[PDB]
């Protein structure tokens, strides 16, 4: 019903399902574009009205949902049109048709992005920005691959790639310029603030930001032939802070500063938990994390200390990842609220960790079950089977806004925060051949001195390497899937440099590549470019070991890497 539900389902059929033909476009309509009336336009627009406690004039309200209205019954048209030639591609009359259904397709979409970006009303519209964006770059994609079996020629294709890859770049930037405008009117000082600022986070992350990362994989140029992404962000939930109405007039730096800074991807191995009490009533006070990296070629670390390490209770509460691992939790929350130290509390005392499978598999509860549910807010994305099994997410973290002492203190809270990574994020890094496939850096092992995780610009998945200093970036471990493969790497550099690759530590291979940036410039779409390495290698060891690194440039620069890809050379 919600539109979170509905943008999920449509990530993972643009990650899995991502191939053109009849199959992809039948998609778009039965996820998005099928539906009559205008009932679903609405929940679109009211998911980030009810955000910003602002509505949009009606005129351009109307006038945007009965726009959609319109391009729901024109691209129902275009996809039957499309299903038909391509059981005959050779009919004369169906190519004719193709050729005049993507030609008002086309332009009914140019006529309908201005009513989705209008004054003072950007934000609220976005959504609905990115779903009609995604269909027009999916069109265009289309008459890439298919125009000249329609009867284009090769000039108005031609044209039609330049407005491809121009329009990935502008679409992209406007999303990433309203969402970040849209997330600075809504922070604020005090504590329901927070939450305000966090559920814009993750509502629009799954609405809109997740979806605009998957734009340049409509380059048909760029990628020829299959590529899989994989979304490393994370997105935060936290049980005792939202269950509750009164706003802690206190801190909202202090929650997010509990937020755990950019840092590698890591697969949280397990959680010990410890219980204190207060007034006959026992809480999760504590706890402890351990976690593996990427692939698991090295050891698991453990995190220093969350909470405080009360022995009210036995310690020992160890829980696990099993399975897919962890895909929700089910909390409760105590509150005391006292009249005027005179404890107040803001804690949990219990929380089931459901596992994900696709068979049963029983869940670990702490203390108790309660009915704050995740996935109230991590919705799945594939919905014809158990939650259980079509989840979106795993848990990759627990921090915890705490704040108060048993001894002294006359308020507390003991606030855990799920950090939730996204299910395309894979726990090894497999390089598979008949297809491109896709490393962003975060999934490395370790990084070498002088490198960065410093947070994404909100158009790459997630958040990134950067170094201002020639020197390698980060040691990451692969798996191999007769096959050589060509290495290119996204980048962001304020200078001209050298882009090498280090395979299983022997040989090394190198280029030459161009700056995209002045200095003191924000990470635009198009400071990002395509460093292609020509020499094409094999690996020695089924699992082997690939460095990137960057040099050759005076130190004082910046130079970002979101992620490497290697392309396989048959196909």
Do not use: C
Request: charged share 15%; glycine share 8%; aromatic share 12%.
């Amino acid at each position: 019903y919600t539109p979170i539900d509905i943008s999920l389902s449509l990530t993972q059929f643009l990650l899995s399902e991502f191939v053109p033909g009849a199959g992809f476009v039948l998609g778009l309509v039965d996820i998005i574009w099928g539906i009559f009336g205008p009932s679903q336009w609405d929940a679109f627009l009211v998911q980030i009205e009810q955000l910003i406690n602002q509505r949009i004039e009606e005129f351009a309200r109307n006038q945007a949902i009965s726009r959609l209205e319109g391009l729901s019954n024109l691209y129902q048209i275009y996809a039957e049109s499309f299903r038909e030639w391509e059981a005959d591609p050779t009919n004369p009359a169906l190519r004719e048709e193709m050729r005049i259904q993507f030609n008002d397709m086309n332009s009914a979409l140019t006529t309908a992005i201005p009513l989705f970006a209008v004054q003072n009303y950007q934000v609220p519209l976005l959504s609905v920005y990115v779903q009609a964006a995604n269909l027009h770059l999916s069109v265009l994609r289309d008459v890439s691959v298919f125009g000249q079996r329609w009867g284009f020629d090769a000039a108005t294709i031609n044209s039609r790639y330049n407005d491809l890859t121009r329009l990935i770049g502008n679409y992209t930037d406007h999303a990433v310029r309203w969402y970040n405008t849209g997330l600075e009117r809504v922070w604020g000082p005090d504590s329901r603030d927070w939450i305000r600022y966090n559920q814009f986070r993750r509502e629009l992350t799954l609405t809109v930001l997740d979806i605009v990362s998957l734009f340049p994989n409509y380059d048909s140029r760029t990628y020829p032939i299959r590529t899989v992404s994989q979304l490393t962000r994370e997105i935060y939930t936290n049980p005792v802070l939202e269950n509750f109405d009164g706003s802690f007039r206190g801190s909202a730096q202090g929650i997010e500063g509990s937020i755990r800074s950019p840092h590698l991807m890591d697969i949280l191995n397990s959680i010990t938990i410890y219980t204190d009490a207060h007034r006959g009533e026992y809480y999760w006070s504590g706890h402890q994390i351990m976690a593996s990296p990427v692939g698991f070629s090295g050891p698991e670390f453990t995190f220093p200390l969350y909470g405080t390490m009360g022995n009210a209770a036995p310690q020992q509460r160890i829980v696990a990842q099993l399975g897919q691992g962890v895909y929700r939790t089910l909390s409760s929350t105590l509150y005391r609220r006292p009249f005027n130290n005179n404890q107040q509390l803001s804690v949990l005392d219990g929380t089931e960790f459901a596992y994900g499978t696709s068979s049963n598999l029983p869940s670990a509860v702490y203390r108790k079950s309660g009915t704050v549910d995740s996935l109230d807010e991590i919705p799945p994305q594939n919905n014809n089977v158990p939650p259980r099994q079509g989840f979106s997410h795993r848990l990759s973290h627990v921090s915890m806004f705490r704040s108060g002492f048993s001894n002294s203190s006359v308020s507390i809270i003991r606030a855990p925060m799920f950090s939730w990574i996204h299910r395309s994020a894979e726990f090894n890094n497999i390089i598979a051949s008949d297809s491109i496939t896709q490393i962003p850096l975060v999934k490395a092992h370790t990084l070498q001195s002088g490198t960065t995780v410093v947070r994404g610009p909100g158009f790459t998945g997630g958040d990134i390497l950067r170094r201002t200093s020639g020197g390698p970036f980060a040691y990451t471990i692969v798996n191999i899937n007769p096959q050589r493969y060509r290495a290119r790497i996204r980048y962001a550099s304020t200078t001209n440099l050298r882009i090498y690759v280090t395979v299983a530590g022997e040989r090394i291979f190198a280029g030459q590549f161009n700056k995209t940036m002045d200095t003191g410039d924000p990470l635009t779409f198009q400071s990002f470019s395509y460093a292609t390495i020509n020499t094409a290698f094999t690996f020695p060891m089924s699992q082997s070991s690939f460095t990137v690194g960057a040099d050759t440039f005076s130190s004082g620069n910046e130079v970002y890497i979101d992620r490497f890809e290697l392309i396989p050379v048959t196909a």
